[PDB]
Ligand binder design. Structure first.
Ligand SMILES: O=S(=O)(c1cccc2cnccc12)N1CCCNCC1
Lengths: 18, 353
């Protein structure tokens, strides 16, 4: 599912600027 | 047509009044922009309470004014560290913007000052914490809830863009919720006065517009792209473009393809396809009718823009608040010293602060 894909990305926490 | 006579006249009058408001607001901004305020308090006016945030951006501390008892959020930057990280211009510009703007969803700089070691920005304490926390906790916002927040961002960007300010740092991590449930925008380190184009690669991967990824000169339309990302993430619980590695996120962003959860309304999907439009000649907020293409879209048909601005709409969510010093909507961090050296550091660099 897309939610499961989101969890799999490992980018569910706070995201830093580049 | 879509509007009868009364509705068209009312909408036209509303749009003209916005122009009139923005012209006055630009006049007020430019006076403060040209003559910034400096040195309006000092450190021993405040008790240090707790660290609210810490990172590459320095530190933000909850402090209490000793004589009024008012709480504030004090951003502390180490002057030597700012110079080392090559952030002098961004630091000066952030404070200059904050002391010059005025809008109900932009955090208020109440005092600023510096000493031998550090720079200090004393801002209103926004006790509800980051939208990010509430979004991950609740999972996703219902469309009316998302819309309430989105409307405030639309108005704030309409204001900032009229001042020729591009924002460039939109994401749930950078939006705070106040005691009335309304949004506060706080971070202006990437904001820039830009009447035309600018070129810097800056932002957060999930929120980067395609023209930034592709190393183009770009304009304020990147903020309308980011609004699309934000609305999507608020309503879905995850952003439109994500992957294990930033390069894979960038491939998705530039592809021109975006896919939606089945619970998104058709009105929402139509708005998002027009904001998340790779083709700049077609992106809402970048066309002849400007912000009005967004404000007049069907998904915002129930939005009373003036009532949002006046903060007369009941918020969908009021964060828990047990007193003026409550920090329960923020994380806990290791408490570090606020060291002030006997010697002044980097005085020349920060004369303007
Ligand atoms: O929450 S903060 O520490 C913060 C900053 C500025 C003013 C604030 C006012 N009240 C609370 C927290 C505040 N924060 C730091 C950078 C990350 N994004 C959100 C702003």
């Amino acid at each position: 599912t897309x939610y499961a894909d989101f969890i799999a990305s490992g980018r569910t926490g706070r995201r830093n600027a580049i | 047509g879509h509007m009868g006579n009364a509705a068209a006249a009312k909408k036209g009058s509303e749009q003209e009044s916005v122009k009139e408001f923005l012209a006055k607001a630009k006049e007020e901004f430019l006076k403060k922009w040209e003559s910034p305020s400096q040195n309006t308090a000092q450190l021993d006016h405040f008790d240090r309470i707790k660290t609210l945030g810490t990172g590459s951006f320095g530190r933000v501390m909850l402090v209490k004014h000793k004589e009024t008892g008012n709480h504030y959020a004090m951003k502390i930057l180490d002057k030597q560290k700012v110079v080392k990280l090559k952030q002098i211009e961004h630091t000066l510009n952030e404070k200059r913007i904050l002391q010059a703007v005025n809008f109900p969803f932009l955090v208020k700089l109440e005092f600023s000052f510096k000493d031998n070691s550090n720079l200090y920005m004393v801002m209103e304490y926004v006790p509800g914490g980051e939208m990010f926390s509430h979004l991950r906790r609740i999972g996703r916002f219902s469309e009316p809830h998302a819309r309430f927040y989105a409307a405030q961002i639309v108005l704030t960007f309409e204001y900032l863009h009229s001042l020729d300010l591009i924002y460039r740092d939109l994401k749930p991590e950078n939006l705070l919720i106040d005691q009335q449930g309304y949004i506060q925008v706080t971070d202006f380190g990437f904001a820039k006065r830009v009447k035309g184009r600018t070129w810097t690669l800056c932002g957060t991967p999930e929120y980067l517009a395609p023209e930034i990824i592709l190393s183009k000169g770009y304009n304020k339309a990147v903020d309308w792209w980011a609004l699309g990302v934000l609305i999507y993430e608020m309503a879905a619980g995850y952003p439109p473009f994500f992957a294990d590695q930033p390069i894979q996120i960038y491939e998705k962003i530039v592809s021109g393809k975006v896919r939606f959860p089945s619970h998104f309304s058709s009105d929402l999907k139509d708005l998002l396809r027009n904001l998340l439009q790779v083709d700049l000649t077609k992106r809402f907020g970048n066309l002849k009718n400007g912000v009005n293409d967004i404000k007049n879209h069907k998904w915002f048909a129930t939005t009373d823009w003036i009532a949002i601005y006046q903060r007369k709409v009941e918020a969908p969510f009021i964060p828990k608040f047990k007193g003026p010093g409550d920090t329960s909507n923020f994380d806990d961090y290791e408490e570090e010293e606020i060291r002030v050296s006997i010697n002044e550091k980097c005085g020349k660099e920060f004369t303007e602060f």
